[PDB]
């Protein structure tokens with residue numbers, strides 16, 4: 060990678076970089092996810108993959124450098140936000156209520172003071188419509204709204 | 206060298222249930238032969254006691270053992286104190302083993318013997334119909350015939 | 366089984382003390398398995414008139430987890446019946462006041478709406494932390510398995526699985542990161 | 543009378559000890575709790591200070607009574623409704 | 630190496646089919662509890678050791694609260710019942726086995 | 727009138743109780759009620775819910791063998807579905823034909 | 826399992842044209858066949 | 865005598881004493897009582913399953929509300945087993 | 959702010975930001991362009 064220090068002299072150097080694992084199983088893919096056959100087989104739990112795709116301080120890396128396609132990039136964005144909210148990344152921090160699958164920012168949602176009738180019920184969103192299309196491994200689909 | 210189709214260990218890569226390998230039919234077949242032989246020699250020597258059976262009779266299935274009573278809801282064209290053979294035995298079992306038919310057990314394998322010991326009537330059942338504001342009201346009293354059978358014996362024979 | 370009649374009946378209708386953990390578990394799945402055990406629906410000798418419930422002891426109710434945004438969207442409504450008694454508190458506020466109220470309310474909702482419900486509620490025991498009284502701890506049998514699988518934060522992955530997971534993308538060697 | 547006072551641990555005094563009026567000091571502020579003068583069963587005009595009904599101008603036997611106690615739509619009376627009782 | 634169910638809580642189930650395939654044979658001998666899995670059984674100089682026979686009389690309130698705490702029930706089970714139900718209760722009930 | 731309609735209600739409630747007790751025993755053996763019932767039918771075992779609940783209460787070893795048989799049939803069905811070809815039918819999935 | 830029974834050809838209701846419904850329920854203890862059932 | 869139990873027909877007093885006498889006369893070591901299973905214990909409705917072992921081999925097990933009645937029931941079950949009158953025994957041939 | 963169902967950028971200096979779950983038009987140079995999504 061590349062690092063800059065300030066001492067007033069500012070200087071940048073190249074540090075050691077990682078490389079691919081040598082033989083991808085699908086070399087004809089375009090995005091790294093498509094190459095490594097992970098098109099619908101990841102969730103917000105896969106912090107190994109997300110830590111591969113994030114910045115050291117919790118932010119993300121852009122598409123033109125990650126090589127991801129747009130759909131995969133948006134899915135990784137949402138997975139990373141949910142992992143950050145669930146607390147699965149304790150070392151990628153900036154500068155007690157237990158959660159998981161947190162879609163919205165916890166400080167921006169308002170309480171559902173008035174649920175509607177059962178035909179117009181105000182539901183509580185869980186998960187991601189981007190992650191709607193993952194492999195189910197179950198005979199009932201995901202329940203995106205509780 | 207990763208094989209074509211290798212998916213890395215993620216939470217949705219593999220199915221959540223454990224992989225089950227079934228034993229191959231050849232040694233499974235000889236193992237079935239050994240188990241059948243062991244149960245058959247247990248039958249021959251007689252290492253069992255107080256057999257029970259699940260028996261299909263009169264559109265029912267009854268779980269009976271020896272010295273039992275059952276109350277069939279119809280007359281059976283049989284005098285009192287008459288010994289008959291219950292024949293449609295779905296299950297016979299004991300401590301340490303159990304035989305299951307598909308769906309009926311062989312008649313050379315298990316024999317259920319019962320005895321008509323009572324032919325009686327049920328208590329009077331009331332059938333009333335009422336519909337309000339329509340003057341609708343009917344009353345009937347029925348009494349179904351009934352037959353008490355005593356299950357005397359359940360015998361199994363070595364035929365496996 | 367050759368037991369005498371009174372010990373056989375006592376053994377069949379005996380009462381069991383199950384243990385259940387909180388600690389990142391959803392209150393409703395905890396409530397579902399707790400309510401099954403409280404009604405006694407797990408027994409093959411179940412009948413609604415046979416008083417066949419069991420004791421359920423749930424610990425770590427202070428460390429339950431809600432999926433989604435239920436901590437801020439879920440509202441518990443009560444009414445002190447004077448004019449103006451309508452109170453609505455979010456799940457966060459209710460948890461911060463009473464650390465057992467959320468699991469208690471979920472179990473109370475999922476029990477059958479009978480006169481047996483409060484008897485099941487007396488047999489339910491809830492503790493917010495690791496601490497359980499000694500009498501309960503000498504009564505417990507069968508810590509039941511937890512419904513969720515604790516999705517394993519990044520730092521306690523060992524180096525073996527970290528370098529077993531492949532690197533997906535090649536970084537340019539000039540990028541700041 | 544025995545009355546219970548909440549104290550911290552540093553203000554514990556041995557049981558059986560005498561206490562006098564010099565425990566306080568002049569120029570201080572205190573709180574005094576007691577059972578008030580009981581007045582028995584009283585109506586709304588003394589218990590809650592309702593305005594009552596006018597004396598003359600046609601009124602039949604209603605001068606000191608509560609009027610409505612609720613509305614028509616509720617088929618009941620709300621808890622805490624001010625009604626005559628013990629003062 | 631395959632077992633359809635775990636073989637360490639009730640019985641060692643071995644399933645089999647006869648040679649004609651017409652009947653299924655189950656062999657289920659009971660499992661015993663191991664010795665190492667059991668637990669051992671738990672274990673005035675001048676006057677007579679008299680009987681400590683004290684029975685405090687509780688009122689209805691504290692007594693029902695004590696019984697409720699003892700048996701993990703509510704109070705309504707311990708509150709009494711009237712003569713109508715008391716005489717309605719069948720005192721020679723039918724009894725099977 | 728309540729007696730006459732309670733005949734139908736009695737039959738329905740008895741079947742509901744049997745399903746409850748079979749579900750209890752099946753989940754005690756790690757299985758589910760639909761899995762147990764469907765795979766016993768696939769094994770050609772025609773015990774109804776009444777005698778299945780009786781076997782649950784009074785013959786736990788026989789019920790454990792039945793649950794093992796249903797689990798074995800379910801694993802045979804999964805193996806056949808995964809294989810999708812002309813692998814042998816499986817020992818317990820063989821159907822006894824009648825003519 | 827009505828669909829499974831239809832796939833195997835064994836009706837759909839287990840009380841339909843099978844041996845479990847058409848074979849006689851009982852016989853005399855000596856071995857004499859019973860009279861035929863009314864259904 | 866069809867539907868009754870041995871210690872309902874023949875009344876005994878010390879099943880543990882009868883059991884140890886029988887084991888001494890059939891040269892089996894003395895039965896050790898152990899707490900096989902236990903539920904409750906500090907409550908008013910406990911369950912104790914006490915098992916009788918011989919040479920680290922289980923010969924009987926019995927339930928009760930107290931350890932003492934559980935071990936006497938285990939003694940009765942052992943006596944029934946080694947007296948042949950068990951509940952699952954072969955029924956009488958009439 | 960003014961409440962709008964549809965938000966429009968009335969300047970080159972207006973900017974759309976999504977804050978507390980709702981969209982906003984903020985303008986540092988023409989503060990009358992402040993808009994809040996309903």
Ligand SMILES: [Mg+2]
Nearest residue numbers: 593594595596
């Ligand atoms: Mg006036």
Ligand SMILES: [Mg+2]
Nearest residue numbers: 600601602603
């Ligand atoms: Mg007048």
Ligand SMILES: [Mg+2]
Nearest residue numbers: 601602603604
């Ligand atoms: Mg006047």
Ligand SMILES: [Zn+2]
Nearest residue numbers: 090093128131
């Ligand atoms: Zn892609």
Ligand SMILES: [Zn+2]
Nearest residue numbers: 969985988991
């Ligand atoms: Zn502007």
